[PDB]
Structure formats: structure tokens, C-alpha cells
Write a protein that binds this ligand. Structure first.
Ligand SMILES: Nc1nc2c(ncn2[C@@H]2O[C@H](COP(=O)(O)OP(=O)(O)OP(=O)(O)O)[C@@H](O)[C@H]2O)c(=O)[nH]1
Ligand SMILES: [Mg+2]
Length: 348
RNA sequence: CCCAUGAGGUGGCAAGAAAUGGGCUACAUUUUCUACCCCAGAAACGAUAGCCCUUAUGAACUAUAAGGGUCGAAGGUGGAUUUAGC
């Protein structure tokens, strides 16, 4: 049930649970969860994550990985309700313990859709602006990480419309504060710091890691429209174009991880979870090869271990449920689906 | 009536100072918007009326119907009573 070694893991004991620290919650990943599960763990008041077979296999990949090889690309995909993104957060935890520069985004659905104010950029042309989300992710990355910002030492300058500029040998904490102070050019600040991360090709001072959730939103059309009642293409958006031009496998110093999510998929049908189906033709042309990782449903013993975890937490107040017929009907109606399992144990 | 009270061809007639009836709309968050029709994300709504334009057929669109831009209120769940339903 419970595990005493949270950082290191093994295959021998599967379905185990390992506790984590509050500083690891608030510093490593304060954003990269669904708000449902965020509040769910807040109500837990006891942060314990479960081990997964594909998670351990991906960790084995990371353990057996050379950075002289090109930047490897991993894609997690489940059946719309598995633990793909939670295993991605587990990878984030492992790499943070490994002391790498991790940049993790909450979701790209929020980027491509639901912008309160879409703007002619001055740093470029033929490009809208995502200022609010830019500053949001900027302060998000600041909260995620500090010595890295202090020691980044950008070897290039950047002027600004605000009668100011930034010169060599300065830490990009100052551009982080720029974007947090004013949000208009925060999109340009983000699209510039992302390029600056790769501007250092050696990456000996740190090792770069990219973590993406809802990758399906990155490849696909937009719901936004132009004020003249005209559609908007995804590549026209500032952040979309920046990210697309940016993640290319050109830095070749580690790995990047992305996860699929159909719950927020737009212009796509229900009960569709195949990678090719989600990322489309343009996605396959963007990254023809990659490491697909199928995140299957819970195993039997892992399922019973999760039940025992809930019982130790006294999550199920229905005290006639801990019995053979109750468990049978429970996992029969659940079909080992983690999300509906969480829902059922929540409202039971 | 049967040089008409019959017959033929042009036009408009067919509006509301007003009262009432049947139906539609919404007066909210079980609501409104976005892809799917149900595990998501936001707002904290309401024009099938009017003005302008486009489209459907007609010989005839001032306006008949549908669509687009604007207008973005009344409205905050009903004054007796009363209607339909096993
Ligand atoms: N404790 C624990 N819960 C898990 C694990 N894997 C899946 N779950 C449960 O399953 C739910 C789904 O996990 P998510 O990764 O957030 O789901 P998702 O990948 O976003 O799925 P979609 O976005 O709908 O496509 C979680 O909220 C958990 O309740 C796990 O390894 N440990
Ligand atoms: Mg006509």
C-alpha cells in the first residue's frame, strides 16, 4: 500500500503509494494538475502518489538515456480517464529530484481556447497576442523555479518599447519581472525566453526538460474568431507559432514529454484516444518518430491496493461497502477506469 | 334580380387611441457560450421587436419567408381565480 522510498522506485512491488512533501507540492508542480484533483488532494491533506507500470517504464527510459543522442520525444496516451498526466507529473517529480531545469505547462487547451482578450504584436507582424496567459505562465515558471533564473546568463540583449533594454550577462529573472509588471508584452517576453532556453546549446550548467499536457490542443484549429467575423488559424497565434517553431529536437540535450487529453479536445469526437487520431496528419509531420506510451487501466492488485489506500484514508464512509459484493459491483461498474473510480469513491 | 341583386378588367381594401383570448420567448445560474451529446473550460441572462443589408420564389419584396451588422429594454417567475394530466 504505502511506500517509504518516494524518489527511487522498483517494479517488484507494484500498486504501492509513496508520500510527498508540501514544498514538493507547492514548488515543483503548483499548476500542473486538474483543479478537481488539486482540490481532491487538498481535501486529502495527505499527498501520496501511486506507482504505475508505464510510469516505471518511462523512468527506466530516463535512467538509460544519453544526452549526446538527439532530444528524445515521449507521448503519453490513454483512454480518456487513465493516469497519463499524473504519471507525467511523476516524471516531473523524478526529474526535479534529479535537479533538471523543468518547464511544465498546465494545458494547451487553455492557450488555444478561452482567451479573454486575443492584438497586433509589435515584436513581430501577422501575429495575435496572448498577454494574460503569457504573464500567467511566466509567473508560473517563476514559482516553479530560482538559482536557474539567476545563473541562466543570457548571452544576448533585448530592447523593449518601454524606453528600456536588457543587456548581456543579466539573469532572465529581470525579464520575468518585466512580464509580471506589465502583461502587454508578456507574450513577447515568453516567446523570447523560450528561444533563450535553446540559445544555450551546451546545456552543461543545467539539463532542459519540457512537460506538456493536452498536447492535442497544440495541433488543431482554434475556436476564436476575428472581430470581422472571420476564423483564426492556430499557427497565427503568438504562443502557438512560438512553441511550434521552438520544440524541434534541435537542442539535443535530453528529453521532452507530452500527454494527450480528450476531455478537452475540440472539434473531435468522443471515445477517440488513438495518438494518430488525436495529433492528426500535421502532428505526424511535425514529429514522425516518437515514443508512444499506452497508459492502460488499473491492474487487479493495483486496484485492490488503491482500495486499501482509500480504506486507510477512511474515504468511503459507507461502511457496508468494504465487502466482497460491494467491491465486485464497484469494479464491475468501474471497469478499472481511474477517473470514474475516483468519482465513484468520491460520491460513495 | 332576370340592363342585374348577373357577368367581364384596373386599383386599393386588409391599420390600430384601445380591451381580451390561445401559443412562442425568456425573467437564471437545472441559466448562457465553446468541441463532443454528457467526466471539460469560462460568463454571470432576455429581440422570432425596430433600422440597414444579403438570400428563396414570384412578373411584383415598402415588405412575404430565411440569414448577417446594430439596437441589448420590458422582464427579477405572476392581481383574484383557473386549466391539463394516473
Ligand atoms: N492516486 C493515483 N490516482 C490515479 C493514478 N492514475 C490515475 N489516477 C486517477 O485517475 C484520474 C485521471 O488522471 P488524469 O491523468 O488527471 O486524467 P487525464 O490524463 O487528464 O484524462 P483526460 O484529460 O480526461 O483525457 C486521476 O484524477 C486519479 O484520480 C495514479 O497513478 N495514482
Ligand atoms: Mg419574390
Amino acid at each position: 500500500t504505502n511506500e517509504n522510498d518516494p524518489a527511487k522506485h522498483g517494479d517488484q512491488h507494484e500498486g504501492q503509494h509513496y508520500n510527498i512533501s508540501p514544498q514538493d507540492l507547492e514548488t515543483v508542480f503548483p499548476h500542473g494538475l486538474p483543479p478537481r484533483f488539486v482540490m481532491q488532494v487538498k481535501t486529502f491533506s495527505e499527498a501520496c502518489l501511486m506507482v504505475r507500470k508505464p510510469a516505471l517504464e518511462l523512468l527506466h527510459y530516463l535512467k538509460n538515456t544519453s544526452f549526446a543522442y538527439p532530444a528524445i520525444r515521449y507521448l503519453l496516451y490513454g483512454e480518456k480517464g487513465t493516469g497519463k498526466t499524473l504519471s507525467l507529473c511523476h516524471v516531473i517529480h523524478f526529474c526535479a529530484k534529479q535537479d533538471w531545469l523543468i518547464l511544465h505547462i498546465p494545458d494547451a487547451h487553455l492557450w488555444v481556447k478561452n482567451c479573454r482578450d486575443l492584438l497586433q504584436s509589435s515584436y513581430n507582424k501577422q501575429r495575435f497576442d496572448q498577454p494574460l496567459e503569457a504573464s500567467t505562465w511566466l509567473k508560473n515558471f517563476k514559482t516553479t523555479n530560482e538559482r536557474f533564473l539567476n545563473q541562466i546568463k543570457v548571452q544576448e540583449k533585448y530592447v523593449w518599447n518601454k524606453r528600456e533594454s536588457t543587456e548581456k550577462g543579466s539573469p532572465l529573472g529581470e525579464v520575468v519581472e518585466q512580464g509580471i509588471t506589465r502583461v502587454r508584452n508578456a507574450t513577447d517576453a515568453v516567446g523570447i525566453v523560450l528561444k533563450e532556453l535553446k540559445r544555450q546549446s551546451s546545456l552543461g550548467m543545467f539539463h532542459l526538460l519540457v512537460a506538456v499536457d493536452g498536447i492535442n490542443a497544440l495541433w488543431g484549429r482554434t475556436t476564436l474568431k476575428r472581430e470581422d467575423k472571420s476564423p483564426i488559424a492556430p499557427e497565427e497565434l503568438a504562443l502557438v507559432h512560438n512553441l511550434r517553431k521552438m520544440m524541434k529536437n534541435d537542442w539535443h540535450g535530453g528529453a521532452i514529454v507530452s500527454a494527450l487529453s480528450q476531455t478537452g479536445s475540440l472539434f473531435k469526437p468522443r471515445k477517440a484516444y488513438l495518438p494518430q487520431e488525436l495529433l492528426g496528419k500535421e502532428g505526424f509531420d511535425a514529429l514522425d518518430p516518437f515514443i508512444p506510451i499506452l497508459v492502460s487501466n488499473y491492474n487487479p492488485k493495483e486496484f485492490e491496493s488503491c482500495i486499501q489506500y482509500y480504506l486507510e484514508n477512511n474515504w468511503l464512509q459507507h461502511e457496508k461497502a468494504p465487502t466482497e459484493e460491494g467491491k465486485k459491483e464497484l469494479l464491475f461498474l468501474s471497469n478499472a477506469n481511474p477517473s470514474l473510480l475516483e468519482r465513484h469513491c468520491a460520491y460513495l
